[PDB]
Amino acid sequence: GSHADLLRKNAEVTKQVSMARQAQVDLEREKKELEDSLERISDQGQRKTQEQLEVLESLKQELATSQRELQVLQGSLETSAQSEANWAAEFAELEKERDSLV
């Protein structure tokens, strides 16, 4: 009857209330880990952006230095070369003399 129905109907509403109060708990908790995960994937993402900027900066620095160094060696080779030339000429003169004496 109407009494049975109301009593049954009401018993269900109580169960649903309980279930909703549970969803509350489960959701509010599931959101706490999303909050954390988000806070991390962000924290990490902003530091990766940095390392990169520091890698790119350093990279330019490294190349620039290598260039300066390469230019200095090109000069040392230049001078050394000029020096080997003199030795030959120097040796030439001694040879000319040695030949004169023998």
Place this chain on the structure above:
Amino acid sequence: GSHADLLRKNAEVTKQVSMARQAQVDLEREKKELEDSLERISDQGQRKTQEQLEVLESLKQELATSQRELQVLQGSLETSAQSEANWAAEFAELEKERDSLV
């Protein structure tokens, strides 16, 4: 009276309809330029991301090459150096002989 009010009231609704039909036109048009601007700032943003990737790649390539080149010069200096040594020794022998004859 009620007739004056309805007639006046209705005249206003007609004016508003017209104004709304205008907002339609103006908005639908203002959105066409947002559509374009967005399509551009995006198109440009995706190509800038590329150039960069190509700058970074090239940069590594350049540094790597400079390193190989620097290493080769370090060797040329090494050999040239060894060569200057020989000249001195070579010159030394000639000198010893020249001194013997004089």
